[PDB]
Design a binder for this molecule. Structure first.
Ligand SMILES: [Mg+2]
Ligand SMILES: [Mn+2]
Ligand SMILES: [Mn+2]
Ligand SMILES: [Mn+2]
Ligand SMILES: [Mn+2]
Ligand SMILES: [Mn+2]
Ligand SMILES: [Mn+2]
Lengths: 168, 171, 170, 168, 171, 169
């Protein structure tokens, strides 16, 4: 699967739906199956859809992670075309592991057409997202996470581009 | 790789939208081998039944044959079913004519529907709700519109089905 | 395709029906690479746990080994997971012996079930509800029936497991 | 407090268990004016239709008349609705005879079921599913049994309804 | 006896239908003290927001004043909440006037909507979806009719609110 | 509505269902309605049903808070009979506001019949519960909570009885 055209139109395979999280799925490219990663014994729920960009490689060693805001949750395993608004910088027990924040391309979501950059997102929503990643590992032995903050679309673009070159 | 099936009485449909869904509209991409997001519908309308297509077919629309599938409960998108046609809904939108085959699961899959053999056996109010949905689900989309002409019997459905298999074969 | 896993303590399962599902019975078609509708259940019942099969195995009924998977929340149909067996539900139906392994996610995947290590750690009522389900869910289907012999330990589960793999490899 | 309604073609039902429900059984406490928890049920059985009672009636078992209500979608427990009878399910359990009126919403409330005027209008397969539920849902409790004698017409339903209003 | 509340910036609403619901429509019965079933909708549509009424008010149609309430997530039918008006949707049905106040929760209850103070703060796409719904939701119901005229401002909502209180008091 | 019989069989009116919480309901005794308190900004859900014991009065000025563990979530606004397993001690912005932990009476839930004390509950569940009340007001200015710890049924009973007294005055 291609990574997509670019930062304004790239592909994302959804692993976890908005409002999900009690079970964490991970896509297994080798087997071509959506797989169970872990059951999360906590009261936290994903504030948005969660997935990765195919044909990319982040420092983490996994494909680039993506957070996707949508009007309603998307079924895990589904592929969708999105555009970046910015990027969330964070680190966990493994190291640095930022997540791009995206919405669907205009062709797929007219309701979000007015949302063009990170500033068009309420700080409240960003706070809730940051809060989720700050705390969702609280009850997991040996696991932790710290959100450094948010950066703009250009930062997202750079990490996206660098992610393409790192792949192949 | 997936056959259209045996015939009008037992053919394959891949479900893209579950009954009562539509807020998010999925579409299967044969090239990628993934169910994909087509669009998010901003309208208050919801699909009145399951919606999908017959693999290995080609309608006059240039897209695989559309199929509405009535079932006791909604089916998960991305799932393949065996169905049988009861008839076909004729309509027209901005892109011209279009038709939707109306089907139910084969008897083996749904004994409860065995007595349903034709459009006559479907609640007139259900057929009306299906018509209304397609009449109305494009109301808020710019440069798009739709109009339902009427319903036609199983034989008409059979003709469109057979023809769509031919078009596919010749591609 | 997909291996069965390494052992009775750590093997692969593809989920076909989610816990609390069943109104539609799905089956995974390996030849087509699609989850398919098997049939719609006429009875007003629901699966008491997730239901699936072990890839690259072959039970006596001609299908891969059946597996019942207990999880904190239902798993989406079509998903592959890593599990470990607690025991096996011995049963026969209209097509012969078709026993089903009872499993839970491997520790790595479910810390909440770390303490569960045997059937005896499972609620007695739950096991009863599971037996009752398979005894009854085919009531309104002509010529279909089930008789559950009873539950047996992990060792019974292992032999059945390490026997279905032989049939498949042959 | 709350009347039984106008008649067999239009009477009141307080819903206690929604169609597809059953994992938790509610019952309405008239003395407190609250919907309460009755019991949680282990069985994998789910109610094949909505379940409730007619207020201001008295059945054999000392409780108000039981009603099964078929609707296009489940109804929230604790809600009051106006229904019309199609017939009556005759049955006996370990505590004696305890029939249940089968009903649908009045026409003004559900056009969809307008064509359903009597038991004959109900598929025998749905009746079997309902009968099966009440015969099996107490299986996990030995020495607790249930037997459905069969289904009787609207006139038999009307007799029991009026008889139960008498006792009250 | 539940009062209408303090005023247009803080009044009471009893929710009857949750956002995204509607397949069953409920009505609160003050006389019986029960939420009741009004009707089942055949149309394949869902409410674009929560729907309820202001207690201790009387609209021209003999029922309490209708209110549409936008919230972050659906509210359970039968629940009371404190809201503030943004405007009013003018509409008529088969019998006559049946306008509906549009509201959001008071700031105390919903911080996230603090910046929303007038209709212009609501996306026109949502308002269009709401208007479309009320124009079309009776389409399949016999002897019913609806026509949405447009949106009016907070001052208009206030007028209607205060008058409907007057009517109630007048008996 | 009375508080019920005692610590082993008392009445709870449910306000928030297990797995709910996005809308925080609160029962208004004056109006006789379940009402919206506020919408919760965090991406979290109650790890169990939440409610109160009628005809009680805790120190914060409200009826005694109760957490009820059930096999499935209970509809908000419903009354149920429960039995205490223990009590979660904690302070919030409004001061000491402990919450009794309970399960249904045996008649209502025979599956929980063997659960008689906190020891009988998964420690991971207790941790998920403590964590929830520690964090659920994170994005709420001037609201905060400190869980002191879990205490036994006798502790629960003492608080229960003390809340009865306060209500009676
Ligand atoms: Mg705070
Ligand atoms: Mn990563
Ligand atoms: Mn088409
Ligand atoms: Mn089998
Ligand atoms: Mn009875
Ligand atoms: Mn009105
Ligand atoms: Mn409190």
């Amino acid at each position: 699967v291609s990574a997509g055209k670019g930062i304004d139109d790239f592909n994302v395979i959804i692993e976890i739906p908005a409002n999900g999280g009690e079970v964490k799925y991970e896509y297994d490219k080798e087997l071509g199956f959506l797989t169970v990663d872990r059951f999360m014994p906590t009261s936290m729920r994903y504030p948005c859809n969660y997935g990765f960009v195919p044909s990319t490689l982040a420092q983490d060693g996994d494909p680039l992670d993506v957070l996707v805001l949508t009007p309603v949750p998307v079924q895990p395993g589904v592929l969708m075309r999105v555009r970046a608004l910015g990027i969330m910088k964070m680190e966990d027990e493994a190291g640095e592991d930022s997540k791009v924040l995206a919405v669907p391309v205009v062709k797929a979501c007219r309701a979000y057409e007015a949302i063009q950059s990170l500033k068009d997102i309420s700080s409240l929503l960003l706070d809730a997202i940051s809060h989720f990643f700050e705390r969702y590992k609280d009850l997991e032995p040996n696991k932790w996470a710290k959100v450094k903050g948010w950066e703009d679309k250009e930062a997202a673009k750079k990490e996206f581009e660098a992610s393409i070159v790192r792949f192949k």
